[PDB]
Design a protein around this ligand. Sequence first.
Ligand SMILES: [K+]
Ligand SMILES: [K+]
Ligand SMILES: [K+]
Ligand SMILES: [K+]
Lengths: 159, 163, 159, 163, 163, 159, 163, 159
Amino acid sequence: APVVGIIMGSQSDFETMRHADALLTELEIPHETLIVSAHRTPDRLADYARTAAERGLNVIIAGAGGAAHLPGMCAAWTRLPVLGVPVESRALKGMDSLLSIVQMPGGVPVGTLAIGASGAKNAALLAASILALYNPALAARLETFRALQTASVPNSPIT
Amino acid sequence: SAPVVGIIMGSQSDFETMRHADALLTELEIPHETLIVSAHRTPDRLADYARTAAERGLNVIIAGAGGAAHLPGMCAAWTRLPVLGVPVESRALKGMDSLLSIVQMPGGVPVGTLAIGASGAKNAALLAASILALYNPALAARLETFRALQTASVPNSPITEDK
Amino acid sequence: APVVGIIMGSQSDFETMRHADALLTELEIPHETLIVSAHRTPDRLADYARTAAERGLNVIIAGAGGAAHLPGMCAAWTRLPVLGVPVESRALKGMDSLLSIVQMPGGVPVGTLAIGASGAKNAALLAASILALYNPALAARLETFRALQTASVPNSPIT
Amino acid sequence: SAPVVGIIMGSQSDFETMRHADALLTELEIPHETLIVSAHRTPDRLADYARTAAERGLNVIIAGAGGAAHLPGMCAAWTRLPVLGVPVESRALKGMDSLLSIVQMPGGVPVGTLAIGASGAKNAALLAASILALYNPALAARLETFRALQTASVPNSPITEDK
Amino acid sequence: SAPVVGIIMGSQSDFETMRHADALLTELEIPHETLIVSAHRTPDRLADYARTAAERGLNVIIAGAGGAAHLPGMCAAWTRLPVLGVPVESRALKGMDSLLSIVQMPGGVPVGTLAIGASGAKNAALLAASILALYNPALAARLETFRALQTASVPNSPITEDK
Amino acid sequence: APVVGIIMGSQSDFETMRHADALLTELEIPHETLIVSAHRTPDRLADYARTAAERGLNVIIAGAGGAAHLPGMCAAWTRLPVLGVPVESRALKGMDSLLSIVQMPGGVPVGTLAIGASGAKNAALLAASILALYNPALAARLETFRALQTASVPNSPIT
Amino acid sequence: SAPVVGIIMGSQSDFETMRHADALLTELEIPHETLIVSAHRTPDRLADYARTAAERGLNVIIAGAGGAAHLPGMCAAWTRLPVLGVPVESRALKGMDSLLSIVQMPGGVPVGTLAIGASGAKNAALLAASILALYNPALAARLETFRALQTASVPNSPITEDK
Amino acid sequence: APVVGIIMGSQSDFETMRHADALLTELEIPHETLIVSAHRTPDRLADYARTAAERGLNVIIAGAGGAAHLPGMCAAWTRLPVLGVPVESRALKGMDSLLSIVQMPGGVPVGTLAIGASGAKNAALLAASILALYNPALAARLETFRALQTASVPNSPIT
Ligand SMILES: [K+]
Ligand SMILES: [K+]
Ligand SMILES: [K+]
Ligand SMILES: [K+]
């Protein structure tokens, strides 16, 4: 049963959001990966978000670009933590994505990650760190992940 | 009597800006309603408002919000009516967050966006009037009178006041 | 007889504005598609805008890039609704286009759409939603368009 | 009694913003500690604070700083706990330097970033509460009550006051 | 006596900025006219002003506007005279909208653009003077005197006043 | 004898500044085209600018990118009109170039044109419009240029 | 007694910012001179100042200016000494024009750039001190004491004052 | 024994930081070139910076991109001068890198250079100018470098 939902506005967003999917798989976190469009499927979004907690989801990772409303509107309909990934847009390079996700008025939060693939990977890692608070086996796997990441950095660059 | 434009805004704070749209529609004798609808705090209210707007006889929606401003776009997601968006000026980023949040709609769901702040609220009312005037000759005449007076009221030279 | 006029500053703008043309054609909205340069053909612009209403146009869609003055100056000369499309510029990625179109002082409006092809498509859709207020057959075709757009969004991404 | 959230900030000046996180955690009855930790002036204090946070029983860290804002990211470098970042508004660049310094973490070390300023501090507390509520039914009920009251307190229309 | 520079601006509000151009041309004894011409509210006035400027004996036009600032560019579209543009500072975007609206003219129709605000108005007058001085030896001498005094008036060290 | 000097910081700037050179040649305006680096050849710059008027130059067109100081420092040393062309920089797309040229404090002006090739072409046209005030034959050629530019704009785009 | 750092600035207005560099060098007992040099109004003064700095015994130059800020870069063009640049905050663009004008030096002629405003002036003095301390053990000790006290003066928790 | 340390967050940063390495080599300045990640190897960073002075380093050049914390955190742990190079990031073109390096609060300085390769070259040259204050042979080589740079600028561009 999935405990993280990864949602994104379109197939084009998957080039970015696949990095969240891959990370959750590496850490053996059960998850679902879906397309939900805030603008084209607003009722699908409302249903997805309002039923997420009763379906057993613990965290939602939502990615969108441009006037990026998917994470904020998801958070409007769920008390679950919602993490937002700004997808890089063609013209404004994700600055529109970033501001339309992070600048939520007080009362409905979205935890926002970096523009692009780094943000997708980090949304998955942040979801993992949330789940690790209550899952000791996962906490150990996350500590192994962080230890390997630290230990694997080379000491000098190659030409 | 029945409203043909709906003005919606995220908050009482937003009304400092959106009141200019309200006032201008009244000046042009366009029946309208003026409401608070919060995209984030009242999302079900928004869905219901937008999806029933056409059947209630509304022709245009003017929506204003600031920051991560989702109200105009999500309204447009649920109505086939034209939606006009006013970016309300935000404290830190001066409405640039508001502007990009509203204007950068992906293809398929439009929001016609006006200037940041009071200028945009005034112009949203005027753009709504322009839309309605296509089918309403009396309003078209009032709008033409408005534009003519606006043009006639521009002086030829500025006033110097060194005091 | 055309009821929407699509105008643009140059041939180079057509790579963007063709998306408005295509959408109007799909919805069977009679329209004209023309080049009008605010800076190189200012008298052509004045004549086009001032005669638009008497020629039977209902909406003007105007696209331009850089210091983009075509939509605003069109609106100066007509009481018709004018919709502006910021064309992506090479250096500043349409941010110059966007600010020079959207930041109209009160008194002369331009309804502005997104930078680039999305904005061109959406200007056509916004024009359609305006015309649909008075044309029941078009209103039904626009509702079919929106219904198909909603229904066609996949539920999950493909690898 | 023992804290489960740590709120850390770079300076007393930052507390004008971060006090909103402190107040909201108290309202939701979430035990927490509220501290000054300077990334640049007390880097060893930061390393020790972050690396011992989990063993001390903390579950979430909320970190706020402005300008070249390194406190949230460097905290995240030393803890496996979720770190939430609040960009404190800076004088010249209005928190844009704060925001980019915090949110643009390269892949591998996350900071969940909230809005510039007081809005972000309030929302960092609410996001922390959302995280804790996953395992705490009493808190989940308090959070649901909070959201319900927030929704119920939005009026239907704005107030006009021309004075 | 007859004007050789025309200073045009979109509004009375713009004159708070453009008055500095007016004052500096007077100081340099350059005959000029100072007018309000609105690109959006008086577009026919603008077309007539620009297309007749050369035949009326004008040599340079200085045009100032803010926001979506179209006055300098549209003036340049209708005259072969050099047009200098002053971006007037706007409230929300601090004249960045004004600046990009004026300076980013596509190839074929130039506007020589000066700094945002009063600095740009002063420098538009000085640039106009530089242009006119090419053909007017008396003015060239006055301009050289101006620059010499400006240089001579810079002190060697600053003043400390802790009070 | 040259009456316009086109100067630029480096060979790399010539990809942009060649458009000024071409325009002046088309209009038969005698000119010189040179490399002068504000940062690498500051004494060359001082000498060039301070002697420009006595050498018979009427206008200087100066192009530079990044922290672009060439136009402003030229204007510091000459009473001639100085026109500045922001060269597009790799990272910041000429926004650094633009702000470092246009934002001159009052007292020493630089008339600034658009980022990139458009700005180079327009600096040449603006120089031509300055020279045309005193040269009737050139004024007629400039009016022909503007008339041809206006007349040559197509009425509709090609697919 | 003889100065080893030169602080130069474009104007008296700039001294509101650059005075912080002056004060901090005095606190660290670093002999220095503090001058106004205008890149645009006194370009020959600048050339002479920069080209003679090394022979006069200066080791570091701290230069501050705003807007289209050319003073640090042109100083660096004429001296082989390290030049540190302080972007002075500008009115409209909040020092972003100052910052990009100073930091974006093409390869070959460096300016070590500090933060916009007073923070940058303080840090230019500290960076100059760090450079001088490489060869001056007494100054190195004073700088180490400064950093130690700075660290020791950071409290563990903030002060709440609801009044 | 190295007197300059060049450090960078990752192998990917070396495409930029190699230009600092090359310049120091040209000027015969002994140096070390290393990878140190502020986020993945924070203890490596603390150790590197705190021991730098006792190891005989005089200047540290630190390059990083995105949320770029390496230079500032290095400066937190050393009294040596720290020079920061903003590495160009994919989405925001190094503007995130630049602001996260240059905007240091008073008390802990980082001398910041341009975004990208120019900044890396200039960090090396600025380090050289610092070392030249105390090393007469190096001062002469740096003056030769600057003289050659000045003398080598062409007088006119090539087509
Ligand atoms: K009058
Ligand atoms: K009520
Ligand atoms: K004096
Ligand atoms: K204490």
